[PDB]
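Schema walkthrough. Field components (list of strings):
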Amino acid sequence: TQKAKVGELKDDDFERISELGAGNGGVVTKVQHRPSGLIMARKLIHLEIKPAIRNQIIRELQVLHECNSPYIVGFYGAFYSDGEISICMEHMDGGSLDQVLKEAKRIPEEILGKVSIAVLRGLAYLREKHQIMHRDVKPSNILVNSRGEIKLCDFGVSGQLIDSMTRSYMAPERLQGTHYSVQSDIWSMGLSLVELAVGRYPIPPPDAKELEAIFGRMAIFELLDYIVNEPPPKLPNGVFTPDFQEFVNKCLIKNPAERADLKMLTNHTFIKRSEVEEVDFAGWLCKTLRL
Amino acid sequence: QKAKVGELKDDDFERISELGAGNGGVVTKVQHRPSGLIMARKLIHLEIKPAIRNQIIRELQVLHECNSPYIVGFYGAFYSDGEISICMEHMDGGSLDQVLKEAKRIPEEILGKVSIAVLRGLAYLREKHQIMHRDVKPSNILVNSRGEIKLCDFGVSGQLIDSMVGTRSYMAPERLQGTHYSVQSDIWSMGLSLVELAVGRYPIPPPDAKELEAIFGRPVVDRPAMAIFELLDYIVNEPPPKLPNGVFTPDFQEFVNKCLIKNPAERADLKMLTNHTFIKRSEVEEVDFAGWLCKTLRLNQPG
Ligand SMILES: Fc1cc(I)ccc1Nc1c(-c2nnc(NCCN3CCOCC3)o2)ccc(F)c1F
Ligand SMILES: Fc1cc(I)ccc1Nc1c(-c2nnc(NCCN3CCOCC3)o2)ccc(F)c1F
Ligand SMILES: Nc1ncnc2c1ncn2[C@@H]1O[C@H](COP(=O)(O)OP(=O)(O)OP(=O)(O)O)[C@@H](O)[C@H]1O
Ligand SMILES: Nc1ncnc2c1ncn2[C@@H]1O[C@H](COP(=O)(O)OP(=O)(O)OP(=O)(O)O)[C@@H](O)[C@H]1O
Ligand SMILES: [Mg+2]
Ligand SMILES: [Mg+2]
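Field assembly_structure (string):
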């Protein structure tokens, strides 16, 4: 729903409530707005750029106001502060998908189906309605909440934000050199699903007995070498359904052309089956995260 | 600069200018209240915060015993809402990377003076303490209006390293291949650093004859920016970069080449380099580094 309740945001209007997370050039915090008692997450990006294009970075970030979908995280506002640029966004009380993976040892297919949908649609939104790819899809960038919503976060709307800036989710074609598009995010999403499926980052593909700690039946160049030159991870053909099996196996074909695309996936039998399934995802969330 | 205050309080600091950020750190121009001394403060926003964070500062303390005209000063370090703060000597000339932006490419005689301090600073940390730099690169070679060339961001604390982006790498071929960091690794980082400052750009995609003619035309012999894997896979498997012919002295040429031998065991060590005729020549030919630094940076100050 829409934040007409507020408007222009300055620094003072905010008050720290909690600490949400930290990343590579970014601290996020639960804060409250003065004018309207809205809990919104505040993204501090500590940076150094001339008093000239910091406006240009804010200007390019303003198209986020034009980004509205129940699968794209709500964007309240962005401004320049003495030290950092803030991005205030819809507060997702379920946090990140790896956060919830940190609690729940693995994430079940039924849920992963609901995730796949929400990402596929979210991806499609930015592509259809804004002509831009989500060049950083990963579990930490899929935000959930107690309302039962799964939403995408942290996409490169701003070209000059990108320029001014243990695991890797990047696609073969993105590492190898040229030829990179919306097929890259498919790979990203694919791996991300396989992660939450098995339980850990699956690029060293778990061995014959690795996953057995769940059921009955290292270097940075070395990593990049594996992704580029070695077979992709697969879901073990036991606990997961042939259709989920096939879904991720279609997302992790190295050749981007061979790899399935948005439409092929969105009409994949796994997605369709997931689309009509009844799952208390808001319930499963609260059963684990406790809120 | 052996300025003293010296027990540092968070609220004693005042944000003046932002200095930059990268690779897990945020450098800020700050002012100290009970001394009036403009220092640099680095925000390493480190996550985990138990007795390990307590070992980090305790390990960092050896930086008080770290004194050489070739190593950046250190006022102290403290815990401040998780994110640790290393407070260091403000180098008003900025990084060598900064001088490369304002200057064209750096003249090979000035690099000689730079080359002395990297080797000497490198050797100081190596011999007096037992740590190595793990991050030699233009942005980590700091200069000043007094004419000093110094070194920072070297790994004093083991814990801080184990506690913490590939736009363009300075890592040696053999390190990328997971054999642990040596002296020779810094040496490689120095070579590439030199070739960078000599030529005016990151050399790893090497300049083709045509491009070299646009740099210092036309004495010339032996577009897009490489992707992450593409880059490293180049650094490893492809031949090392070289200084162009007929522009820099044959001695400078052999110096940097000894620095950039892919085989780390065949690479020049600190002794070879310090006794190299390029470094010998560079010592006797006293050149006004302060005059050059200040005149190309419009920074002329009384030291
Ligand atoms: F916080 C947000 C909320 C929403 I809703 C949409 C975008 C963002 N943030 C970003 C971001 C962004 N948000 N978080 C990060 N973190 C850094 C991710 N990277 C890691 C390594 O290399 C490059 C980027 O980048 C980048 C570009 C851009 F145009 C944005 F709008
Ligand atoms: F800020 C400083 C000032 C001084 I004088 C000396 C060291 C540091 N900083 C560090 C640092 C440090 N300061 N900045 C970085 N950033 C680079 C991170 N990388 C480490 C290794 O390889 C690539 C990048 O690391 C690391 C370990 C350590 F023990 C330190 F004391
Ligand atoms: N709107 C939000 N609501 C709740 N939690 C959030 C929100 N945005 C981010 N977070 C949390 O804060 C953390 C930091 O996010 P940030 O994008 O700065 O880094 P990251 O996603 O962890 O990794 P990277 O630096 O690679 O992006 C995330 O892991 C996420 O759990
Ligand atoms: N003591 C200092 N005095 C003045 N400027 C400094 C000092 N230390 C760092 N800087 C500036 O801050 C900038 C960013 O420093 P920082 O070390 O965070 O990233 P970096 O220099 O790119 O190296 P790395 O990414 O490996 O940390 C540098 O370009 C340098 O100009
Ligand atoms: Mg993120
Ligand atoms: Mg540095």
